[PDB]
Structure formats: C-alpha cells, structure tokens
Design a protein around this ligand. Sequence first.
Ligand SMILES: COc1ccc2c(c1)C=C1Cn3c-2c(C2CCCCC2)c2ccc(cc23)C(=O)NS(=O)(=O)N(C)CCCCN(C)C1=O
Length: 549
Amino acid sequence: SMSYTWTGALITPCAAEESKLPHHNMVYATTSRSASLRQKKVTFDRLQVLDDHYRDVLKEMKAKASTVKAKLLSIEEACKLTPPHSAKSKFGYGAKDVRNLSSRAVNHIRSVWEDLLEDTETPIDTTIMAKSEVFCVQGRKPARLIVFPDLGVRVCEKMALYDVVSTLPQAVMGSSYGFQYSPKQRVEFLVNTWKSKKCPMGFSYDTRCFDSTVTESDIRVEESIYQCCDLAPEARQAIRSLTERLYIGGPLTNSKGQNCGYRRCRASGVLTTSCGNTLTCYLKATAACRAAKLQDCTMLVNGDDLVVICESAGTQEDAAALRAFTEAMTRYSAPPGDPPQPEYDLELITSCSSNVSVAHDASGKRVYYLTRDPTTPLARAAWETARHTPINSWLGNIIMYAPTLWARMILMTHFFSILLAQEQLEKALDCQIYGACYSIEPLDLPQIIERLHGLSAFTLHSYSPGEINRVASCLRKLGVPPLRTWRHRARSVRAKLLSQGGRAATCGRYLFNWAVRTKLKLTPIPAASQLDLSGWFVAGYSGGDIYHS
Ligand SMILES: COc1ccc2c(c1)C=C1Cn3c-2c(C2CCCCC2)c2ccc(cc23)C(=O)NS(=O)(=O)N(C)CCCCN(C)C1=O
C-alpha cells in the first residue's frame, strides 16, 4: 500500500503566493512551487507487522474507551464550531453562511449527513493544497500538504465526532494525553515524572512523515476504539461511513478541480487527525516500550509528538533498548526521522518543539517553565508585522511562552508598541492553540498569563546561561537588536500604557515590570481567577477546522 499515488496534475494555488517579505532575506513563506519536493517525501510503501504486544495494548485501550458515552452535536452546535474564515463549500456557500445557518448551507449540510447514512462506500472527494508557513533559512523546507473535504462534510464530522475526539483520548490515555495540559501543567507533569524515577532516562521519538505512515489498518483500529463508545445510531453509521469513505483514503483534487491522485494514509485536514494520531502514536509506542522491555515508562503524547521518561538500567543497556524500541516502532509502521537519543538531563529533551528550562521567581526560588529556540516565532512575528495575517502566531506564542525571556523582552515590547501606535489595543485577534482558533483581546493577556503560568511569569529572572545565549545568538543571526535595546523599548511602551489607565495600565504594570529596576510588588489580579478558560487545554484539533469564541 502506497501512501499516495499521483496522476501528474499539479498541486496548484488558488491565489497569488508571496515567498519573501516586501536580515529579511532569511525569512520565507512556503508555496505550491515546492509541493513536488514534499510529494516525494510523503510518498512510500508501508509494511506493517502487528504482534501480541500491540494487540494487548489495543484491548486495554478499548476497555477504557468502553466507559465513554458520546453525544451527537446539533447542526447549530456544529455550525458554531466553524471558524469564520474556513474554506467555502464548492456548493455555493461559505463559513459565514454556516455560522449564520443560511438556508442553502443547512440544507446542503443535511444532505451530506443523509448521504453518510445512505451511502457506505463511495470515496468522498478531498482537496489537496500546499500550506503557507513562514520559516528562517538554515537548506530550505518545502511546503507541507493539506488534505481536506468540503465544508458540508466538515460540519457533519463535528456532529458525529466532536464529542468523541474531545472526550475519548483522555478517557483512554489518562495523564499521557498531552492536550489536557496548559504549559505550566505540562512542565509540572514532566518534572514530577522525572523526579519520580530513581534514575531517569528520557527520549523524544520523531516519526518520519507520521501521517503517511498511518495505514488503513491503523485508521480502522482507530475506528474500532471509537465504536466502543455508546453512540446514537446515526452517529455510529456516520462514523462507519466516514471511516470507509474519507478517513482511510480517497481521491485528491487540486484547486483547479483536476484529479491529482489518491491517498491511502491520514488526511491532515479532518476532524479526527489529532485524536487519530494521538491514539495511534500512543498504541504503537506503548507496545514498543513493552517489546523493548523499557522499565517504568511514563509517556506524553501530542498527536505524532512523543516523549517517554523511564527507569535507567545503565548507559549501554538503555541505548540497546532504544534501538529495540525503534525497531518495534518500525515494524508498526513508524520508523524514525532522526534516530532517538537517550537523555539523562530533562532540559536536553525537546518535545512539542519545546524544552524545560529554569529561572527564579522574585524570592529566588527555582521555577521550571517551557521554552524553545525562538527563531521561527520571531520570523513569523516579523512576517505578521509586515503582511496581513488572519492567525496571529505572535499572540499564541506570548500566551504559550509567556514566562520566556524572548516572549517577554521582544514579543510583548514589539507588539504592544505597534498596538499602542495604531490605537488597536482592544481589537480582538485570532490565534491557534493546539489547532483550535481563538479570538483574543491583547489587553486581556495579563490575566490569561497568570492563569496559565502563575504570577511568577511576571517575575522570572536569573535565566539559564544556555537559554540566554540561545536567545542572544538568535537575535544576532536575524539582525534583531540585542536585549539591552529591548529593555529601553520596554520602558517606553510601559510608561505609555500606564498613562492610558484601565486595562492598559494593567498590561504596563504586569507585562513590563521586568524592564524597570525599582520594581513594583505584583499581587494576584482579581479577574484572573474569575476568567472562564473552559475548553482551552482539553483536546488537540490540528487540521480539524475548530473555532472557539
Ligand atoms: C528572519 O525573519 C526576521 C526576524 C526578525 C526580524 C525581521 C525578519 C526583519 C527585520 C529585523 N527585525 C526583525 C524584528 C522582529 C522581532 C520579533 C517581532 C517581529 C519583528 C525586528 C524588530 C525590531 C527591529 C528589527 C527587527 C528594529 O527595531 N530594527 S531597527 O534597527 O531599529 N530599524 C531602525 C528598524 C528596521 C525594521 C526591521 N527590518 C527592516 C527587518 O528586516
């Protein structure tokens, strides 16, 4: 079974494509012009051999799934989960019509749903497009490819599966399900799991082109888990029909409506992508841990992103065991890109593109937090400054990386400076968190941050020398002014925000307290504990077309 087959029709754009900004020669956005390069990478044969460990784990997973009772969402509910700028239907209505419950949209959606009950076999058409993502040069990344069904189908997926994909992974995987954690909760789990071992070893495992390694068997095993839920009859049939007609594979159509080929692996743009990937990664890895005889494994899975922390049995012993792990994973159809390295320092493990590092609070107590190399964040921030973007990655990065030296010194200072200069401070902006779109007001940051990271996110200091160097290195490389310039700029943004009063004075006070030396005594913000953040860190939805507001 080939992950893809191709006809020769191009992966076409549907609108003009900018590759560069209008050191800025280092930043680029991917385009359909590099799609052939990606097609080559993601196209291969999958050989899969299942063993007893795999089957044991699956049954364990299904017994936990069998506690779940999932609800069918109403049309209205599913419509309201649709992002305002979601791709329009080929049937002559758009996302705004869906959210408005326009007659044509609803009647098409109802027709798609009935067709899932009435047709159990006919492959559902999908669109394949090159994704536009910004990066900094190293070699140069080709465009990722996105594969998604029509809008009417996506609304139907929600109806059948939103509650399942939102509830089941935690039911099945418990503390291992990564998307239930805010960054502080994630860091807490990572450090506690590290501290709980007598002699800890840990590694990240990077599967090469995970979506393509996902087999038809994998996707039906996934369905077998969903089917353990108590389901409405129509939900059960829709899940079965969606599985056979969409999830396992189908025809690929370009933006010009030409047939590009055929898919027999995971679609990146379906509701079940994150959940499916998570369950599948967790299944294979847990089995592989047993095959390798890894002792007292604790794992954390976020889709295809995997970290395992375990008991060390000695250096040479662990190496041997990682190799057994990787061989088992490979048998399961998940060979690695980079071979995995055993790690005896928690900070040296990168997972969800992040590592643990340490700073100190105002009292000088150690505080663990999550950080990353800031190159991509800053590149995307630069792009977003210059060109209009719907999804503001800078706002997501400030939220998720609030405690970091770079998020605070550069990102807050820069964007608050711009918002101040355009008087667009209260203006709500979309951003993605674990794949779900969120509309957020910049002036609401300080409360959001206390509730996600604690008050210590405003008082961290005495950062790691290695973290310090990575940030300063990054700035010189990208031509960004050094931290001393950002401290001068923070002081100016701070004074202005304070003088605005209201929610601006709050931002100024809490967000830029680091910039001044005679510091202010920060104490809990009232509206922070009162903030409703339900459904924020509940599940992953990359590619699932989900909007929360
Ligand atoms: C590889 O992709 C990147 C990454 C970073 C930058 C850029 C491209 C584009 C850049 C450099 N740059 C960049 C940023 C980023 C920092 C993070 C937030 C987005 C902007 C600057 C911020 C201030 C400044 C300059 C910043 C800044 O104030 N620079 S400056 O010396 O005072 N100068 C007077 C302003 C020039 C504007 C920057 N510029 C032309 C760039 O090409």
